[PDB]
């Protein structure tokens, strides 16, 4: 029985995450890299590996926005497609499936709100009617770009577009420093249904200080939401940090938080789940994982158990 059959419409109380009959449920599974560089993973075949196979329950399509990066700016309605193509294979499945505006060197979301604003408003209009499509409204906002000044603002336009029509499928907010400053929420959180806030960290770059400011959070009634997270450190070049990968994801399920790893390509770094030439359509043996990709394969089996 699919991830979606069982357990329906989720609803944020509190710091935590709901299935339709109030029982705690975590997500866990994998991001695309970006869908204009390594799209030919976002489809039915490698999700249906994914859900059947690694046993994942939730997909995130990274849609980048800046321009220079051939982002959504540069290229909406090709990029567009490639996350209904994402949303329709995840919604066949019965997997639950993010849609990130993949925000970074675009570090201020405010720079394309007005375009942000449509395009989650149509994604709304297709995918709001049943429970699968979460919506990333900003992956990483970074720079001298605070919750108070300028996340939060960008925020609250975007959920009362969303919420006009989507009254009830979950939105995930990015917060400050690539989404490390959960902290900063309580001092004025949004009064909108179901909505949760970013945590990003790399194994080998990030500690116990931020589980301590994520703490923080939760202490103050912050929902929190993992919704990227490396195995490498944040330059890529350390190779994997398998135990402190461990360590970490020991602390998201002692506090059901759900997560999903980055990311579900085959490029040539530490973070890869991937071996360069595996096959779009997924099925890929052990030689085609890579040691990330066989550590995170073995985590999401070995949580179902
Ligand atoms: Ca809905």
């Not at 993973?41 to 800046?66: E, H, I, P, S």
């Not at 993010?98 to 394309?112: G, R, S």
């Not at 999903?260 to 789940?273: G, P, Q, R, T, Y």
Request: glycine share 8%; proline share 4%.
């Amino acid at each position: 029985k699919t991830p979606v059959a069982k357990n329906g419409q989720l609803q944020v109380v509190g710091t935590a995450l709901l299935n339709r009959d109030g029982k705690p449920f975590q997500l866990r599974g994998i991001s695309t890299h970006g869908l204009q560089w390594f799209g030919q993973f976002a489809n039915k075949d490698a999700f249906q590996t994914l859900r059947d196979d690694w046993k994942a329950n939730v997909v995130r399509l990274a849609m980048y926005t800046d321009p220079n990066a051939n982002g959504y700016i540069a290229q909406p309605e090709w990029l567009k497609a490639k996350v209904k193509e994402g949303v329709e294979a995840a919604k066949e499945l019965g997997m639950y499936v993010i849609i990130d505006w993949h925000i970074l060197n675009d570090n201020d979301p405010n720079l394309y709100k007005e375009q942000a604003k449509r395009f989650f408003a149509e994604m709304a209009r297709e995918y709001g009617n049943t429970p699968n499509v979460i919506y990333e409204i900003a992956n990483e906002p970074n720079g001298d770009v605070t919750w108070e000044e300028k996340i939060r603002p960008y925020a609250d336009e975007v959920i009362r577009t969303i919420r006009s029509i989507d009254r009830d499928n979950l939105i995930i907010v990015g917060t400050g420093t690539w989404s490390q400053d959960v902290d900063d929420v309580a001092s004025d959180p949004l009064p909108y249904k179901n909505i949760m806030y970013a945590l990003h960290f790399y194994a080998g770059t990030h500690g116990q200080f931020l589980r301590d400011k994520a703490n923080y959070a939760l202490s103050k009634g912050t929902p929190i939401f993992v919704t990227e997270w490396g195995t490498s450190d944040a330059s890529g070049d350390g190779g994997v940090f398998l135990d402190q990968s461990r360590e970490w994801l020991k602390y998201l399920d002692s506090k059901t938080i759900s997560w999903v790893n980055w990311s579900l390509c085959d490029k040539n770094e530490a973070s890869a789940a991937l071996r360069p030439g595996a096959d779009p359509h997924g099925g890929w043996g052990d030689d085609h994982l890579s040691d990330s990709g066989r550590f995170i394969k073995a985590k999401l089996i070995e949580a179902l158990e």
